[PDB]
């Protein structure tokens, strides 16, 4: 029973637009719970799960001012980065940030996170020690030296060990019914004839949460990389997820094939096969 919190932040500059659009999204255990967007009429952080309406107006006023601060920080940084990469006016650019904490099932901090990307690529990141920085790009070295000289790492470390953990604990108590549960996958196999003397067996899994899942096919023993087709896990749109995996099989010898579904809601892996 581990836990996590993240804020995913994005600022996008576009050619003629006056100034960048800034979006921040907060997540508790990988579920969205707050959101700010500078394109709204009255830009404010907003609840995105029912359990967050417990928070009084001082919570929302403070987080909103923080967001407006972040917006200005991303605006100046975008400007600085344009100069660092000798990019000219008239293009589109992106600055992103992930930050947050992971807790063990004892609710102790497992790991802190602080990373940035520019144009969708690693720019700079705080290492797991919460003291040193990784920056690959020559242009990013300028930021690394600046942040090393100002003691930025100490500032982010205090947030990640302090507030991030403290307020995550408070959120986990407040939403203890909503995001404790999981939905087990319900699975079935469909049959689909094809090119003479062969058929595809499609193993479906439906209605599961969270998204993490594995579907394997077995020829009475070993797995199958031998053209096992599959799809990426996809949202149903109602909070659950879907996935399938398939394998080409001789017609008649289809009961030598078994599909297994591995999901954290299951008491044990499901085993399954085609049934007329």
């Amino acid at each position: 029973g581990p836990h996590s919190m993240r804020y995913f932040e994005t600022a996008v500059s576009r050619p003629g637009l006056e100034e960048p659009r800034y979006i921040s999204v907060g997540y508790v255990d990988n579920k969205e719970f707050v959101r700010f967007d500078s394109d709204a009429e009255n830009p404010r952080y907003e609840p995105r799960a029912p359990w967050m309406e417990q928070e009084g107006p001082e919570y929302w006023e403070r987080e909103t001012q923080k967001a407006k601060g972040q917006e200005q920080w991303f605006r100046v940084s975008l400007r600085n980065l344009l100069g660092y990469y000798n990019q000219s006016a008239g293009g589109s650019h992106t600055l992103q940030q992930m930050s947050g904490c992971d807790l063990g099932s004892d609710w102790r901090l497992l790991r802190g996170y602080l990373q940035f990307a520019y144009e969708g690529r690693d720019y700079i990141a705080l290492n797991e020690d919460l003291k040193t920085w990784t920056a690959a790009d020559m242009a990013a070295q300028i930021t690394r030296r600046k942040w090393e000289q100002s003691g930025a790492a100490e500032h982010y470390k205090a947030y990640l060990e302090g507030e991030c953990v403290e307020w995550l604990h408070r959120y986990l108590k407040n939403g203890n019914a909503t995001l404790l549960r999981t939905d087990s996958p319900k699975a079935h196999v469909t049959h689909h004839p094809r090119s003479k003397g062969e058929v595809t067996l499609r193993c479906w899994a439906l209605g599961f949460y969270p998204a993490d899942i594995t579907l394997t096919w077995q020829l009475n023993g070993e797995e199958l990389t031998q053209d096992m087709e599959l799809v990426e896990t996809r949202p149903a749109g109602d909070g659950t997820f879907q996935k399938w995996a398939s394998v080409v099989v001789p017609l008649g010898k289809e009961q030598n094939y078994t599909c297994r579904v591995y999901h954290e809601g299951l008491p044990e892996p499901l085993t399954l096969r085609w049934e007329p």
Binding site: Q70, Y84, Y123, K146, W147, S150, C164
Partner: peptide, 9 residues
């Protein structure tokens, strides 16, 4: 509770 950033890039 969201982070607030330190020095700009």
């Amino acid at each position: 509770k969201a982070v607030y950033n330190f020095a700009t890039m």
